[PDB]
Amino acid sequence: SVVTKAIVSADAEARYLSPGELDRIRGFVSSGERRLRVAQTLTESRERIIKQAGDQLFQKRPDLVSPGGNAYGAERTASCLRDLDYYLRLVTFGIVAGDVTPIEEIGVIGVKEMYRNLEVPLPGMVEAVKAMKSVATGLLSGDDSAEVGYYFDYLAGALA
Amino acid sequence: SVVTKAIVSADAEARYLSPGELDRIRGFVSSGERRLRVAQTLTESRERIIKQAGDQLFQKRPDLVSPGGNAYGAERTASCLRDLDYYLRLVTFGIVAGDVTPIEEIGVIGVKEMYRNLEVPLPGMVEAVKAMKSVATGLLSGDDSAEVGYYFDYLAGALA
Amino acid sequence: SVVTKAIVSADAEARYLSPGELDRIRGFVSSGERRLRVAQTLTESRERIIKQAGDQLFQKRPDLVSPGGNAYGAERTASCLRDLDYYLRLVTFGIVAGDVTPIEEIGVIGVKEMYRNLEVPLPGMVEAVKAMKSVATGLLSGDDSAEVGYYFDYLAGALA
Amino acid sequence: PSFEETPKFIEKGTAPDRALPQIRSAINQGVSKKRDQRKIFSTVGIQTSLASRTEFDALIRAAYRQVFERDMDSYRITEVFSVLETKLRNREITTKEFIQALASSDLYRKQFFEPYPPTKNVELSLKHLLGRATKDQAELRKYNQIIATQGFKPFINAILDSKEYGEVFGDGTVPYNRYPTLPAANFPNTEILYNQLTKQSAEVVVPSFKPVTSPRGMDMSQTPLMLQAMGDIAEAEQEVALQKPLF
Amino acid sequence: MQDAITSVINTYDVQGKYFDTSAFDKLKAYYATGELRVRAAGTISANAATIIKEASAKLFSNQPDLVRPGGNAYTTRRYAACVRDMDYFLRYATYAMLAGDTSILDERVLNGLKETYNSLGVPISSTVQGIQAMKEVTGSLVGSGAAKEMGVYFDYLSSGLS
Amino acid sequence: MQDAITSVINTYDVQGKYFDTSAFDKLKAYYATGELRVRAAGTISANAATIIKEASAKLFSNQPDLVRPGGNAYTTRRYAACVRDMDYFLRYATYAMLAGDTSILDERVLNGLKETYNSLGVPISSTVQGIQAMKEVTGSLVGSGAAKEMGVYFDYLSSGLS
Amino acid sequence: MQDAITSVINTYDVQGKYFDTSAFDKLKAYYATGELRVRAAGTISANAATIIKEASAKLFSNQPDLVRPGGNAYTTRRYAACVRDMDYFLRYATYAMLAGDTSILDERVLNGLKETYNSLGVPISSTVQGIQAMKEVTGSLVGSGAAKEMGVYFDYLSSGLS
Amino acid sequence: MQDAITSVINTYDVQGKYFDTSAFDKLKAYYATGELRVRAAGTISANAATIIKEASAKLFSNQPDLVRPGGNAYTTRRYAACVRDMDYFLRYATYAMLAGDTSILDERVLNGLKETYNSLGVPISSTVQGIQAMKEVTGSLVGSGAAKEMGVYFDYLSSGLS
Amino acid sequence: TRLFKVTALIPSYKKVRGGRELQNTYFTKLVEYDRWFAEQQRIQKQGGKILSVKMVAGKPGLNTGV
Ligand SMILES: CCC1=C(C)/C(=C/C2=NC(=C\c3[nH]c(/C=C4\NC(=O)[C@H](C)[C@H]4CC)c(C)c3CCC(=O)O)/C(CCC(=O)O)=C2C)NC1=O
Ligand SMILES: CCC1=C(C)/C(=C/C2=NC(=C\c3[nH]c(/C=C4\NC(=O)[C@H](C)[C@H]4CC)c(C)c3CCC(=O)O)/C(CCC(=O)O)=C2C)NC1=O
Ligand SMILES: CCC1=C(C)/C(=C/C2=NC(=C\c3[nH]c(/C=C4\NC(=O)[C@H](C)[C@H]4CC)c(C)c3CCC(=O)O)/C(CCC(=O)O)=C2C)NC1=O
């Protein structure tokens, strides 16, 4: 997180944290509680988010669940929604951490190679993340929507 | 090119070409006429290849030329088929060169970033190249089809 | 051999062998019988080749077998002809392999220091292996003689 | 008749007409082809010294050509570094320590440290060991201070123990020209350094970086955004005046 | 580098002076504009890929020969380098607007850029029109005041390259 | 690395012998198998990605706890590293098949693999199962004749890890 | 650097044209001479020490002052540097002969050579004479057909230095 | 670098001449001044910190503007850089005195120093004045015998900058 | 003292590399004494695990001759 990044940055020069760096950490731990409420709200409504995002994705991209598509089949659709569940959990992790670092180091490094091995179309993943962002921001208030959509946009850019 | 590759390897070692590299150049020079015939055959039928590949692509992916698609409209479809023409020209260049170096240097390095700035689907590029491979290898004999499909397969793997 | 060099070239940039390298291997294994015939021809006539090369060497460089010469005396002349036998065997190995790698790994790497520690003049070696080239290419036909002369010339240049 | 019009994708890909002078320039315009027409030598094999001897000697000679800019056979470089080569064959040391021993050698010091002032020393050793010219003023200060206070070998080890060397070359690959895109002026200075033959010029390519501390003119106080700022601070001051008692 | 705060600090340090009322006024002006600067930086960062999309599209529409065969932006590699340079310019212009000063432009963009491009046959005028394309796209997104602000740094890059 | 030809060359070099009828018979045997080896190598080069896809799917179907959280293959990074390892196994088995000798496997693939897996926590048995699944998938594509030959090198890889 | 084939490819790429009859004619002309080029290259590589031998002997016979005190080639170090340069010219002329194009000469030999020699004090005219001596020796060794086509690149190097 | 002995050796080597009476005279002259040079070098080694202290103090007393705000030596960083430059100058002038030759000065100090100082805005006149201050302090410490010799190298450095 | 023999694993977390890299993952290397603080610091920073280091050349506790 921000504390870890600051500590690593200081250990790069083998020094204690600057007063400004400690002020940055103070601001982070001040925003920690609101971040915790935002992640609480996202984790409470995970089932409805996954359901709505999957439905919206499959209506926008019928070929995925149509015969010949990668997502066709009950088990394959379950795997798709399970991937959506993974990425929602990672978004919550990134929100509490305040940075995209947990998101990347669980689900962004090697994601293209994995989905290439899995025949999974990347634009389908991008659209899934976009619909998922739309649902999540719909459930959240105006203030929370900006930072929550930030991590979803980062994830979509990573898949794109 | 094979000659260029051998000379670069020898110069990177500050030595003369070994008998093995000279034998490689011997083999490459001997097969020159056959590769020239294959490249001439592809060149003489470029319009047929591009038009048939485009027809197969747009049958397979009707969304690209539907309104709101990347290649919708006469001018954008012309630009699409111009991209296919580019890659057919690079395929002939690689055939005469004996390796994928022309294809790699002209149309592979940075292709994903370019098509991302052009908001052009990479899967659609993949089916377009596969259609080109099918149409072109149809015109050739059994032996030449393998060599030409090697270049098409390299390019398609480069795209996605 | 040719197979080993193709494999290491493939491993250099980490991909499966290209059709050019596979055709190279195919031509190599097709030409196996002729090069085995060449190796048999040079091997069965080992003694005639060694004696003629040694006699020609001592004619053109009598100071080697003159007093104060490195090959002066019966034992030293025997050691001289023994080294000639070594290099003829290495030439047959290189013919069978299809390249000069056995010659290098058995008799070129460190040959300069080795012959410096033995007070063996390197020009004497060059002229000896040139005599052995002439004697060996006399026994062969033109196509085989050219291939064998390639290995002999490369050994002469390595000793030079 | 059945007129067959020229397809649109033909003209969508046509180039402007070009005579020989423009064709030659169009072939040779961008980044030099040496960027891709080159080999990068790395100790990919952890196998014993018995096998792949020729590849490993090729790596050794590439390291010589990278550290000393050419072959140094007349200086009997092989016997000078014989024990070092033996250790690198036996896999006791990695490529980075081989490079460190060549760059900290007396031969390297005579070739590239003794003949030149410390600024040229910084840029030459950065070319040989990091693949790029001196980067900014901070790097020049850092290596100048090391050269002034500790000398040549701590300077070489400061270059070689830097994080940048570890990220770019690690412990197995011989350094090479990096054609750096960033930061500003690194690319042309690096190209000037790497387009020079050995002893081509004794001049310092990057003497220092001209400071950007103070420009002449353009105070930016007339910027309409800043003007709006001075407008709003006036309103704030007026409000503060109004919270005072009216009398 | 240098920002507006550091600019005031350096001006008063070269004079060896403690802060005066004028220095405090300049600092208050920068603090007044900080929020607008942050909003412009955030909206630019959110839409940077789109700005590059449109700017490159306009540049290659007005100057087709750049992307026709033999042009300086004709290869996947050279086209990628072109859009990468445009993203560089956008990012550093955002840095400069957020800083409120153009010293980062001279230090980290323009220094050696003209002779970088001249050693490469990159058309400097075409790069300048790409920069005005970015200017026009960015101004419509950030709003009028932030448009006039971003224009200062875009014109600074255009003038330094010209 | 040494192929069959270089193996015969070395075994006659350690004895100081010129080639005799036995060496020539061995070389003829290799030259006879050469076309089959080339055909198998070309077939695998055509279908390498398909083989890796099918074999990884089989492996993770048999042992689904590997890709679930808590498994060694649970992340994008670790799944990518797994399929990358499988790619290396297939490509180097193809190299050894073409050479006709297994020395490259020990020389490059199997040197330090045991210690690296044990110290990184990579489970050996599941990697061996992945190599096996690679073997059955490859045997079907190459053909029955080349299937046994490629199975020789796959079994060598597994036994080295086993 | 460019060989003949990649030269044709580069011209037709920057022109955006498919190979026509002229391009195929040039490619055929290069393929016809490849056997000659490879034999000349192998012979030169086998006799390179001998060529430099005789050429340096001719140059220092015609210009005795170069190796006597006060000459640029008077020391063991400077004599070795001179013969090393002649090895450079022979090796790169052989490269350009194999490639069938003088491009590698401009890229990797003549770039900065005139002014490097001027800074060092190497006499350029004497270097041209040494290149001519290597031309004569190489032409004697490799036969007339290869002799003329090696002389082309030797003249290219001489004119580039001159 | 080059000293007096190696200078004589190079002069006679270029002529290909054994040492004559004049060469032996110059060698005797250097051997005669050697003990004085060694004593001066040892004294400067003993008192280098004091020399730099007093020289910098004198320079900043004559030119107080240099260390006050707005001067090129006003900050801790630029003051340390000034002292580091003077330490350079003292050590290398000591080397040149111990060698009896100014070559090391040209080839380790003066090459590019004017360009560095002009790029940085370092005042050349004040650096020359600091070198004069070092000259006075060093001459006072080393004594009348070695002061004249040491001033030669200090004056060489000053004339090289100015 | 003057020499350590270091055996360390350096895992990869930033990217999955196209090259083998099984040159650089598990290794045993000889590092001179004054080098080891910085070297160990580096392996610690890229997240590596130091498996062992040994004295090879010199003797611990020497006051000169190091
Ligand atoms: C936490 C990091 C992480 C991720 C992200 C991850 C993804 C992942 N998805 C998988 C399967 C799958 N995933 C999908 C999802 C796709 N189908 C549609 O096209 C959509 C566009 C898209 C989802 C939005 C499908 C269809 C499969 C089944 C593939 C198959 O069995 O052939 C698998 C194979 C293992 C298994 O099925 O249990 C992995 C490893 N694994 C991880 O450890
Ligand atoms: C020689 C190497 C090379 C390539 C390959 C290349 C591609 C390329 N395609 C472009 C446009 C385009 N390319 C396409 C092609 C896409 N349409 C469909 O989606 C398909 C999936 C796909 C083709 C099969 C389209 C539709 C455009 C028009 C985009 C626009 O005008 O907005 C452009 C922008 C400039 C222009 O339109 O002339 C480039 C640079 N450029 C190069 O220098
Ligand atoms: C942060 C400040 C900074 C910048 C901006 C910068 C630009 C820059 N552009 C380069 C090449 C290039 N730059 C361009 C840019 C395009 N050419 C087209 O004609 C357009 C007019 C134009 C942009 C709109 C192109 C096409 C290349 C050639 C790349 C190649 O040949 O591979 C290079 C050479 C190295 C490389 O390509 O990676 C640099 C360093 N460097 C810096 O340190």
Ligand SMILES: CCC1=C(C)/C(=C/C2=NC(=C\c3[nH]c(/C=C4\NC(=O)[C@H](C)[C@H]4CC)c(C)c3CCC(=O)O)/C(CCC(=O)O)=C2C)NC1=O
């Ligand atoms: C200052 C350093 C320096 C040295 C040492 C040097 C040696 C040197 N000796 C030469 C010739 C020669 N040197 C020798 C000497 C050999 N003859 C016997 O074999 C002996 C074992 C041995 C001498 C003891 C001979 C025979 C030649 C004539 C070679 C020829 O013309 O083919 C030449 C060629 C030019 C000439 O004929 O003058 C040089 C450059 N040059 C230098 O600049």
Ligand SMILES: CCC1=C(C)/C(=C/C2=NC(=C\c3[nH]c(/C=C4\NC(=O)[C@H](C)[C@H]4CC)c(C)c3CCC(=O)O)/C(CCC(=O)O)=C2C)NC1=O
């Ligand atoms: C392949 C591209 C390439 C070339 C061409 C090249 C030439 C070259 N020759 C050099 C030295 C030299 N070159 C010569 C050659 C002269 N001696 C006689 O006068 C002759 C007339 C003449 C040669 C026929 C000499 C004497 C030196 C030594 C100069 C010195 O150290 O003072 C140097 C200085 C650094 C070094 O010796 O490595 C270069 C760069 N370098 C390259 O990387």
Ligand SMILES: CCC1=C(C)/C(=C/C2=NC(=C\c3[nH]c(/C=C4\NC(=O)[C@H](C)[C@H]4CC)c(C)c3CCC(=O)O)/C(CCC(=O)O)=C2C)NC1=O
């Ligand atoms: C803006 C950064 C900056 C600083 C800090 C700075 C300090 C500084 N202090 C100086 C003298 C001095 N400074 C001190 C102060 C010390 N004596 C006591 O022991 C105390 C421990 C301590 C102060 C609390 C003294 C006594 C002198 C006189 C030394 C002398 O005359 O030789 C000088 C020598 C030139 C001059 O006096 O004008 C400098 C450059 N210069 C700078 O450009």
Ligand SMILES: CCC1=C(C)/C(=C/C2=NC(=C\c3[nH]c(/C=C4\NC(=O)[C@H](C)[C@H]4CC)c(C)c3CCC(=O)O)/C(CCC(=O)O)=C2C)NC1=O
């Ligand atoms: C051995 C040959 C050699 C020398 C001497 C040399 C000097 C040198 N002086 C520098 C800066 C400097 N040098 C000075 C010293 C001057 N300004 C003061 O006012 C004095 C009047 C005067 C000294 C008496 C100062 C103040 C700086 C800092 C300039 C800046 O950072 O803006 C720098 C830039 C790197 C750094 O700041 O650490 C170099 C390289 N470089 C060399 O390769």
Ligand SMILES: CCC1=C(C)/C(=C/C2=NC(=C\c3[nH]c(/C=C4\NC(=O)[C@H](C)[C@H]4CC)c(C)c3CCC(=O)O)/C(CCC(=O)O)=C2C)NC1=O
């Ligand atoms: C070129 C020869 C070579 C091979 C083959 C090789 C294997 C290998 N795989 C690795 C990563 C990995 N490999 C795997 C895959 C394993 N775990 C799963 O359970 C699977 C059953 C199984 C694959 C079949 C995983 C999960 C990692 C990540 C381990 C980590 O860093 O946490 C690593 C650590 C370096 C890296 O992360 O890139 C090595 C050394 N190393 C070599 O030098």
